[model samples]
Structure formats: C-alpha cells, structure tokens
Target: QNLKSTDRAVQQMLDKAKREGIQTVWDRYEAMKPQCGFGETGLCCRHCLQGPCRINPFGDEPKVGICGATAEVIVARGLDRSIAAGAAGHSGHAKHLAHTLKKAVQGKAASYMIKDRTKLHSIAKRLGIPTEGQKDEDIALEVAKAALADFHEKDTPVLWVTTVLPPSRVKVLSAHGLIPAGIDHEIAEIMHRTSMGCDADAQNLLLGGLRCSLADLAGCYMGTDLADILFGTPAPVVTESNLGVLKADAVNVAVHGHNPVLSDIIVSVSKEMENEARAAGATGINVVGICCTGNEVLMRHGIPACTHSVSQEMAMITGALDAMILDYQCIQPSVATIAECTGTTVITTMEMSKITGATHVNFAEEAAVENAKQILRLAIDTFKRRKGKPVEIPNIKTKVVAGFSTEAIINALSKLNANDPLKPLIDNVVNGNIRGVCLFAGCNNVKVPQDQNFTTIARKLLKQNVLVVATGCGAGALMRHGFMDPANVDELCGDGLKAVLTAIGEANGLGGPLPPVLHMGSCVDNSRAVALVAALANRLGVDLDRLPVVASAAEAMHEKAVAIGTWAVTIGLPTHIGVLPPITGSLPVTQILTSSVKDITGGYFIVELDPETAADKLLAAINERRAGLGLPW
Candidate 1:
C-alpha cells in the first residue's frame, strides 16, 4: 500500500522501497494501524506515578481519568507537554549555538569565526551595544552575552522576547503575562506546571503552553540572528530540489535536520575534499540538503535539496546518497534501518542525537574542519562501496529561487521605492489589489498527503491575492512543487501579487518575477517572518493583531511546529493547522484554541482538515483583520 505524495520522486522511491522490501516512514505509519484516538485527541496522560490515564474522546467510558483528572486536564497537560518538548528542542538548539558563538568570540572555538560582520554590527546596534570603534569580535561577544542573558533568571522579560518585538506589543504581552521571563525559565515551568496536581485548570495549563511558546519564539529569533551572524543571512539564490538532485556518478552527501553549525563546515570542506571523491572513481562531491539543514545551505549557497521530513528515507532509496549527515531535530530514527539497507553512510554528528548502527562523528566547533573532512571521506568511502547497488536517481527536481530573509525582502522592496520601501506593498493591500499576507510553515505529516496540503492551500490563497511567505519544511514543500521558482509566479500568484512581485523584481534589477512564495530558511528562521510582520505592523502604527496577516502549517507534524504555531497565535496571527494537534479531546481546550484564545492574544488556531476549506477559513480571518484595520479586502 503506497501512501499518496505529491512528489513524483517520492512515488518512484516508494515503488523502489516496495520492490526491495525496505520499510519507509510511510510503511511504518501504515503498520501502526488504528492509531490511538486517546493520544490523538490529547486525552491520554502519563504525568504521574499513580496513573497513565486516558479519557474517551467519544465520551463513552472513563470520562474521568485516574486521580480524578478530567478530559480537560488530561488534554491540557498533554498539549502543554508537547509545547514544552517543542520549546526544549528549539531552545536547546539555540542554547547550543549561543554557547558556540560565545566561545568563538572568546577565542575558544578555533574552527568558528564571525562570517557576517555586518550582521554582527547590526545585532550589536539593535542590542544597544556601542559598535563604533569596536571590533566585530568584541561586538559579537556582547551580542552573544546578551543572547545568553536571555536564559538567565529575570524579573523583566528576556531581551529577544521584549526587545525584538515592539514596545507596544511587549506591553500587550506583559498585560497578559505572556511575555517570557526567561528562555530556560519558561521551559522549566512547563515541566513544573504539567507535573501531577499542578495546573489542573485547562485554561491555566494552556497559558503555561503560551509562555513556553513565546520562549520558543524567543529561542527561534535568537537562533536566526546568531546563525546570520555566523553563517551569514540568506539572500536570493537559485537551486534545485527533489531526489533527482542526487547524482549517480558523483558522491552525493545530504546535510539533514536543523542545526547549520556542522553543515556550514560540511559545505566548505566538501569543496576542499572534492578530489577525494574524484579519486574514488566518482565525478565529484555533491553536497545536497535535506530538511532544515538543506534549507540552511540552500539559502546561503545554491545547494540542491534532496527531501524533507516524512520523505527523508526516500532519498536513501534512490541508492545515490553516499552519506546523510544528521545534526539534530526532526530526523526520524527509522532512517538508520533505511541507511543500512541502502549502503548509504549515516553519520550522526552530534552526541545528543546519536543513532544506533550508524557511524558517530562527534562534531565540535574547535575541530570543525577535521570533523567535516572525516565526514566527507566517509561519504566517499561509502560511494566506493556502492559498486553493484541499484542506482535509481529519479529525474525529478525543480528550480528554487530562495533565501528571502527579512533583510533580503526589505532590500528588494527598497529597490521599488528607496524612500518608502513598504509603501508599494501597503498600497496594494489598502487599494484592494492584495488581500493580505499568509505565511506557510511546519513539516509534512504522514497523515496528510505529503506536500499536498501546503501546495493546495497556497494556490487557493494565492489566487485570492494573498501574499505568501514560507519557512522551514513548509518552504521545503513549496520548493518541491515549483512554487518557489520565480517562473511559476505568473502561474501561481493572483494578478495583484504578480503585479507587485514583477514591479519589485524589475526594480531590483531582475527582469523576471519574484518567487510566488518567499523561502525564509529553516524552522529556526521562522522569526524572519515574525520580523517582517512586526516591521509592517510598526510602520502602520498598529498592533500585530490588526495586521492583515496570518500563518498556517497545512501539515504540521513536528512538536516545534506546534510551539511555533502557538506563538504565532500569541503574536496575533490567526494560525491554521491541517492535522489536528492532540487537543480535540477536551471541549474547553479546543474551544480556547479555536475561539477564546483570540480574545486574549488577538490570534487563535483554526483547525480544518480540508486544505481548500482551510485556505477559505484563513482568507475569512484575513478579511476580518483587514476590515478591522479599515482596509479593503
């Protein structure tokens, strides 16, 4: 039984997997037939020693869980735990980078250096550090110090949480007590509040989720900023994607997962060791990206992306992948078995994310070059072992003009009209030419038809003249379907968006159109969208809730995605999710997510399974926000 996926590359690989008798994520998903409804509905709870309790979504038996925990409590606790895990995952990643950046500045991390001095200076200026006559490393130290300070105990909100957002927005969040006190503090609270006999009220538990969600937002913003400072901010770059990017004659290596620290070095070292691959009777070293790591390198360089999230194993099935180097989050553990079956080298880079049966290459910034060289050699060695292996490189890839960072978008806008960069965009929205803006994000879920939801919803919204921006796996989905190709703008975008994009492109010295969907880097770079929106809101002198903007993760499977979507609502963007996040088991929690939360945060979750209907619902919400701002829809 083959799962339906939009990518022809995935379909081809699915056939290959069936023929070889190797199980893919889709296969494992199907094997877990009749997924637990209690867990699916968020009614299952195992927060205490006294109980691993579950409430009936159907309300038949066990209406109340053991220890007298009601459906509302169980659901609230479950969702809170998910948010905590998501926050921890992202913030943990951020903390790791923060320490590295600090170490680099302190001259302790020998292999790392400040790559984007301009970003360093800008961040220093943003943080109120005196950059005049200061060395880039000096300013970076202060900035890294500030970033680290965010995780410390504090009475006032964290720097990124309060400083990054507008003062008015800060005041609003402060009023609701939603402003994160500290990054680690909020994460700690989630663990504490979700503990047994604590935070029983569904509403309070949800608030805990909100705080941690904001911490997640803070963490992602810091990660993006620090990443820009280290790896340089992504600008427009043309690349290709899909399994076709995998080369038969070349030694193909994919950098998978979120962190770019190791992958950044991999790109540099791959070029340095290309001759090694050639010596191994391969054409050259082809370093492609998978998931967020792919987005990272693809944004900076023009590296091709092989796959994303659910279809990660399919890249291995192509039989052309020499090595898949993983850093951290969103890499399914099942890929180990797939790698073993395919003769592809699975090199786990980080100690925290070590996989069994795969080669462990401990990646440290101090020895970044040596580590990268070793990893590349492993790929080359693995490529040599692929002598008699069936090489099935699918002829499927798409042109992607990606790396639309906030700075990049602003720079493009600046070309249209130097004095008023946002004027053209605002005029389109005000004059009924552009309806609103919607940001598509999150990962592909097995439950949803791969990228189908993302593409389906984007087309519907684009036809209605809603400007679409994307990041993380959502950007991956768009790139896979040619939506990120500038040539597709005429076909995918509505008339108003086309006019705006063409004008912007022509003004920016491109004779062609801008991509219909802006690619804003990895999941960690979701803050790029937030920065864009916050700037727009600031320009209009209105709160974020009043902006004609929204976000959706048409097929969100990652816990970090939920954390992101939660903060999106908190930041006043109506968020849509295609797959129901495990909270529908409780009426109060569901009602709060759908309706009541809006009253507090000016944003709420809209869960609609149908992508088309979800787009319509988002449009309705966008129109409502526009009407609220007295702008034409």
Candidate 2:
C-alpha cells in the first residue's frame, strides 16, 4: 500500500508516518476525495456578490452565471486569475532579490558581495546600460534599479523579456500583443479584466492571460540574472539527494522554499558555525536543501537535497531533521503542524510568509551572515536537546551531478568546438544524434504518485534520444531517480544521445557520459533553459517555433507552473501539463489553448494525464517541428 511515491526514501517515510499515526499530504488528499467537479472543470465562480455561481457542465439547468457570463467567459477568467497569481509569486521572488542586490551595491548590506562581476557586466551591456569607466558597484546599482523598474509599466517593454528572447520571438510576441508591458501591469490588468463586470470575451481574456504569463517569464529571468550576480552562477557539481542525506550525528538543517538571498548566506554561515555545532555535541552541521531553495544551493554549493515538493513533509518524518528554514513559495503550511510532532523547528524568515506556529526570524540582507549564524545556533541548540532521540534516517540516496547553468553547459560544449560551442549540439541535432530537446520543469502533485510522471516520461524520451534538461521539482524528481547520475546514461539514453553525451563528458574530463538529464537549477532558472534555446535558435537563424524544442510540466501543480506553462506556449514551444488546469468546462477555451493558439504563437498546450501518452505527444510535437525545418528525426 506504499504507492504514494515512486521514491523509496519517501515511501519509507510514509510507512513510518503511517505506523506513527501521523498524517501526510497523501492522507489529506484522500480525506478530500470526490473533490469539487465544478471547481475542477472551471465551472464555478465566486468573483462577485451576485454569485458563488456554478454552471452545469452537463445539460442540466444553468449554462451561465447570474452576471450573464457564459462558460467560456467564466473559464477564461478563472484561468487568467490563476496566471496572475503565478506571475505575482515569481515576480515577487525576483523583486526580493532585486532589493537585496541594490542593498549590496549601496554598501548597505556588507554580508552580500558581488560573486559574479562578469555576469553583472554582461547583464549591464545586455540592458544597454554602459559599463565603461563605471565601478562594478555603480553598474550593479543601475542593473538593480533596472530590475526593480521592470515590475512597473514604462515606455519601453520590460528589458528582461525584450532582450533575452530572440528577435523573432519578440516580433511574434509583439505581433500577437503578448509582449508584456510590465510585470506588475500585466498582473494588475488580469485582475482588473477578470473582475465580474470587466472584459467578458473569452478569446480576449485568454490573450490577457498570455501577456501576464510573459511577465512571469520576465520575473523569472530577472531572478536568475540577479541571483547569479549576487550568488555565483552554478557550474557542474557532484552531490547526493533523497531523505538519506539526512544525518543522525550532525546538526541537520534543511533550507526549504525558494529564493537564495538568505539560504545562500545560511549555507555559508553553516560552515562558519561547524565548530559551534561540534561544541554542542554534534559531529558537524549538515546543510541540505528542500524544494527550489535546495536546488538553488545545490547548484552553487553542491549541497545535498534532502527532499522536494510533496515529499517535503517526509523529510520531517525521517525524525532526524533538526530544523527546516523556509523563505517563500512551495512551502506547505502543514509542515509546521507536522513539525510539532517530529521535534523539527520550522523557522519562517520572510516577513510576508510566516507560519502560525513556527519561529519567525526577520531576515534582512544588511546582517545576513549574522542572521544566518543565529539561525544555525538555534539548530545547534535544538540538536543538543534531541541528541539521543530515536531517528529513522532512510538508507537510500542517489548520486547527482547537477548545477548545469546555461553558462556551464556552454563551457562544457566549448571543449568540443572552441570557436563555436553550440556547433556540436546543433550539428548533432541536425544529423539526428539528438532527436529533439525536451525541458522538464514543474512541481509534484499529490493527485499523481510523486515523481512517477516525471520519471516515466523522462525514461521514455531519453531512450528515444531526446536531450532532457530539467529545473525546479522536475529536476528534483529526476535527480532522486538517477536521471542526473552520469552512470545511468548507458542504461537510460539511446545510442545516439549516449554517444553525444560521452563525447561532451569525456571532453570535459568527466570520464563518462554526462548525466542522462541535465540539472539546470531551481524553478526561476527555467530562464536558463530559455537562454539555451534562444542561443540555438539564433545560431540556426530560426524562431523558437521552427526548432525541435518542447517543454513539459508533467506533474505540475502550482499557479507558478501555470504561468510558466503559459509563457512556454507563448514562446512557440509545445508545452505539456500532465494534470488538466481548470479550463476544460468551456469547449472554446480548451480548443483555443490546445489547437488554435498554435496558429498565433506557434505553441500550444498538450494536456495528457498519462505519462506514456504525454511522452509520445511531446515527441510527436518535436518531430513535427523537425519536419517543418527539414531536419532528420
């Protein structure tokens, strides 16, 4: 009956929780069975006082709301609102990094320093801000301001979106009015238009959603850029993952949630306080990651990832995790309640995202190291209290060779062809050594067995010679399953892909093939995937739509995933979501999203719940693009 997760460590933790009479996400999901059909189908609306309306999906009674809104309008509005929420989450995370970077440049935050001056200068040039004769701090200040400015409406389009995408993509987005004016503007517009008495045209509403989703892309891109400038851009690093990374003899502190502003500092501070942890009778301080925050540090520092997404609670269930530090996003509030039973200290750092029963340490960049030290001290003290506690650390782990940012990938490829780094990849793709490229990016949903869809689809695609890159929980899922282990290449990859990977890996002196799937980074680092594709498209003299590229959030389950998927579609990639969003109630809305949108943006959604069928559809889409480009597949 341990069928909740494909991960053995997670399944063990779930078994432990069951024996202990503790509830987890799976138990709660079962409790909420036969979940609302109206909400699931987007036939329910609560936008106005005139209604908490429900439209009959069947030919029963009402087909429209009390406000005279049809199913099309209702469904489109709901979808738009979801996109807006997603944009806000991503943009907010970016804005937080912007402020941290600004403070660092202003000398107001001493603990933070520019780790990647080259990236800062590169971004400054890309944004048209002159760097000649300017101090790095001054240039960084301007870059920070520009990042902050991107959130607001201005005469020019958001620089992150306007510059980062290919010229053809910009034109495509511009022609369809999908180019976002501002990150905040698009989100606000969605909110305004989705109001009860506002725009009711289903097509227009969907277009607005697309625009907002592009803003989400802007936010994500800025987040990655700023993070790299502040924390060094990730290069390839070898690490381990899963619940077994937890150590019973160490002061185990798991940094949860997204955003590296504090988590990076915490990682640094953990090393500084290792002596303190030993002084408190612990062997050492073990700093592992959970969720995107885990991905962030794992990329930069090679920290082990303890767990991610829905299995986050399972980390606590292991009974060895002393403290879980949370920043923002993808953090389940239920973890706090679970912490109560597990003797885990759930520390919430962000002022905006505080749990009711958890400890709150107001984290500020000004004294980031000091705050990190304080947090570590707390964990060490907690370790002292729970020294001889009975712990169940799962004896399972996977070797992960992660931290492949766009820069790292290019560096690896440069070894193959120095003058033209992308040539090897492009040539291989053209000659059919790589059938297509697929980016797996999204979260874990409890409705599906955790990591099942991601693992299933990746296995199918990799065997077919589809090059796979992953970010966020998608990367976590794959890494935990050995997809990011270089040794698995022979077993998981097809002959063509294995040959290509071996060439690059041996060239880089890795002694073997690259990992079957490239671990790109956290959720925000999906921007890395975008940058890679844009470079390839520019090299090939084609728009993104003309390339054999696709994206899938096969087990996606967040508003951020919705926004990310929408922008992926807008950028001319066939995007797939394993779980259906709440837009199926309206036939027009579903048709336009799945079929008609491709005519305008050269991208569309493929909603397939089954992983095997999902992989087939994505491969077909990639082949269709390859055929259009006259490339062998």
Candidate 3:
C-alpha cells in the first residue's frame, strides 16, 4: 500500500517525460541521491553570521554550535522559523484579500464585487462592525479595517485570534501565554527570539512557536471569511479532476497557483470568449485548475482540476494545454520548461510572481475583466500553435463533488433533521457508527512517490470507519485517484461510514452516496474544517481536544504544511505527518513535540513514514479520544 498509487494518466505522462528525457520533480529527487542528513534531522543552523552550524545527531562528535547552541536549541529555532514563515504566508494572503476588499469598497477594484452579501454582513457583524443600516461598501470598509487591524496591534491579542478561537481555548492559551499579540508581532518576536542565542530553552522556544501557530490559525480563519465574501460562499459543485480533464479539441487553459483574484475572473471571462475560441477552430474554452487555484474554482464553479504540485509538469506533458495561468505559491519553475517543449503558453499573472521565462501579464483588480480576457485570448491565440499537431491527451478523468463549505455542510445536515442540525452527526460518532473524523491536508513531497501516502492512508482510514476530509494537495491527490468520486463511496468506505454518507447524501437530494472523502477547499481553507469541528465541540459541550478528530499530512513538503500542523496541535488534535519533519536531530525537542506537548496542549505530532502505520497511529489516537469521552468502541 505504501507503493505509488499514481493515476493511469499520471503514469502515461510520466512515461512521456521519461521518453522525452525531461526531468520531473521525481527524477530530480532521484538525482539528489542522498539528501543532507544534518538538514533532514534539523541539526543544521545558519541563522547567525558567526558560523554555519551542524550538530552531530549520532552523538560521536561535536554537539554544540560556535555560539554554544545545542541540537535542542537549533531544532526548536528552526521549527519556530518554519511556523512563523507559514503564518506569514497565510496572513499575507489574508492581507491581500483585505486590501482587495478595501479597494472594491472604495471603487478602485472594478472587476471585483461583493458576491456574497450575506457573508459580508455576517462577517462584518461577527467582527463587531456597525453593519446595520449601512451600505455594502461601508460594511466592507469596516471589515477590511478590522482584518487589517489584526496585524497592526501592539498592545492587545490579535482580534481575529481572540475572536475566532473558543473561549476555553483562549483561556488555556492565555494562561500559557501562547495567545499571539498580533500577527506581525508574533512573527517579529519569533525572528528575534530565534536569532543567535536569544531564546535558548527548547521548551520556551517551542511555546514561542505555538504562539506563532495561533497567528497562523487567525490568518487561516480570516482568509476563509474574505474568500467567502469576495467569491460567493461555496455550494455543491460538480467537477472533474486529473490531467485527463484537459480537452484536446478546445482552447485548454489551466489556472495554477493559490489565489482566486485573477482565477475567478478567468472563469467568468471564459464564457464571453467562447465564440472567440470556437472561431479559432476549437470546440470552446476548457478551463481546468491546478493546486489551490483549482480548489477555489472547483469549490465555486465546478471547474475541473488539471494537476497538483508534484505532477504540475506532467500536465504540460499531456500536450493539450494551450495556456497555463498562474498567480502565486506552489507553482514550479519547471512548468516553463515543459510548456516550452509542448508549445503551451505559460502566463504569470501576479506582478511579484513572474517566472523567469514565462509571460508576465500584470493583474490589476480594477481592470480584472479586461485582464482576464487578455489572458484568455492568449490561450485562444496559442491554440493555433498546437493545432493539427500530434497532441496526446490521456483518456482518464473522474467526477468529483466538491464545494463543501462549512455553510454547505450544515445545510446538508439540516435536511436530515429539520430542527437539530448536528445531532445526527454527533449521534453517529458517539455510537461508533461513525468512528470520528480524520483530516488529510498539506502538500505533495517529492521524497515520497507522488500520491502514494495520501491514497494509502486515506483508504486505510476510511476502511476503519474514520470520516475523512481533505484540503490542499491532499484533495488534489485523492480526487485524481478517484476517492472524490461518489461511485467509490460504497466500495471504499466502511459500512458504518457508508451509512452515514448515504443518509446525508439522500437528505441533500443527491440521489446517491456522497464521495468517500469530503473535499473542503484549499490550504488556507483548512478553516472550513476548523469551523465544523468548533461547532461540533460546542454542541457536544466539550473542548476540541475532547473530540475524536485527528489530522495527517502524509506527503507534506512545505512550510505552510508545518504551520497548519502546528495550529492543529495548538487547537488540540493529534496530527500525523508521513514525511519526516526536520527536528529529529534533537531528541529533547522531538520528545516534547511527540509526547510532552499532549500533556499541556492535548495534541502532539506523530512522525511515521509508512502510510498504514501512520493510519494505525491516527486510529489509536482517535480511539483514545473516544475512550476519554466514554464512548463505545
């Protein structure tokens, strides 16, 4: 089961790459031979100018740095920086959307409007803005101001952090001094603390990382609210996934990266430019997705996903993509290389994210529609470049039921029991008919063969009756492997899990079972699962730690994944990671993270490379939580 479970189309594309002698991430990983052991074990430290330090993990040689920094100190410092970087990435995304909201309200961003007014007013009211009797623009301005205020505060805990988390969590975090004062403040303090001999205590540095992890949580929740308000709150959307979604007879375009600003407009503009595509001797425009950009559109518009991180270059190898539009984050530079060979146009939309050899089309929200058309027109015009060429498209695709926002999930539940929305779900879990929930998230690691860990761990968890939900590249991996296909629900899920899914699906008028795995949006959209869990905890009159919920990033390879996993632990859920985090060099640091932290935060990290072993650990953790709640096995 730990072996590669790459889809047929993916295998074909990989074969194509091999024959053409183009190195993919996998091949590059192979070429690296042996990765740096010191770096892998988190023993390497280059934080200060005094020296680049590497401590011996095997305990045969030097154990301290030039500045007397121990392995424990170095590992803790490295982890703290990763958590801070992750917080910065998510918070940066939130800041961008907040500014966009401000610009739209001020009539500066013309192409963007409040698509979900209900969400706008609700969020504004939630943030304590004066929304009553105010215009949409006024309310949006206030919301923007409040969201922006999370980063600027110098004397108070971050507003979003304080408000979004449960009171019990806030109290616990406050008592431990783990509540972040502000987004930027926490990041700055972590940088200062991790600097040359600043904060040397491993335990203290870990707490510093936890405080910053809360900032990451705040940023994720805020990003979710802003995404919902800008793009309409997601509802049930039918989509397809995998590179097979590429259309050979159309102007095939793929939106890659993580932002929705330009990607959403591209989806909208595609409708108006269909005739133009048809005139170019194609059927029409085919808009597919890659990475979180795919998640955004799939959750909103049912646009098919083309590929995820590891297989991004393989999408071009299909030889069908006319253009690949990118925004920012998770986009590989090798995409430019593949596009060159395939005659596919690689367009970078974000000014700051321009690729070296790709075309840069600066995206301004004020002229988004025009910018979108210009981008689409490039795809259409590029269609002729590949026309009559011997283009090969893999005949493999799978239907996916995406767009399960927190609102959508609750709405689906309400149909089952008109008055008590969450009771059925709770009852099922309490009775062991549904054996708790497991969220699979994070990025694809080249160290592991593509989707091997994700697919293996998911099926193993599902077989154990664990309710599985996915986000980010985890969702991409599962969808590509057909786990998101409703047809596999009966075959893959345990009888108990199958019954619950069928009941909910029937109630939602789906006429069939829901997918085995729930595709909750992208990486930052992990907040969707957080909201669901928080509601369940509130209804059950318990803390999040008391719930039989866990998380796993079986193939993680990014700082953002570390941040998300850190926040998951901060909020008290045992998180499993398939890929080894870079903290194995310090036994003290590793011991605290794996065992000691659970005593305080009620969560800890479990590092197991084998997927089934990881699933077993996750199940044992879930059962432990269930037993703590005095629930039946």
**RMSD to true structure for each model, in Å:** 1.2, 0.8, 1.5
Backbone clashes (count) for model 3: 0
- Candidate 3's displacement at residue 480, Å, is 1.2
Residues 1-633 of candidate 2: C-alpha lDDT, one tens digit per residue: 347999999888888999999998999999999899999999999999988999989987787899899999999999999999999999999999999999998889998889999999999999999999999999999999999999888889888899999988999889889888899998999999999899999889999999999999999999999999999999999999998899999999999999989999999888878788888998899999999999999999999999999999999998888999999999999999998899998999999999999999999999888889888888887888886788999999999999899999999999999999999999999899999999999999999999999999999999999999999999999999999999888889999999999999999996898999999999889999999999999998989999899999999999999999999999999999999899889899999999999998999999999999999999999999989988877
Show where candidate 1 strays beyond 4 Å. Answer: 1-3
Sort order, TM-score high to low: 2, 1, 3
Clashing pairs in 1: none
What are the runs in model 2 whose C-alpha is more than 4 Å off?
Answer: none
Candidate-wise lDDT, in order: 0.88, 0.93, 0.88
Decoy 1 TM-score against native:
0.98
Query: Against the true structure, what is each candidate's TM-score?
Result: 0.98, 0.99, 0.98
Error of 3 at 203 (Å): 1.0
Q: What TM-score does model 3 achieve against the real structure?
A: 0.98
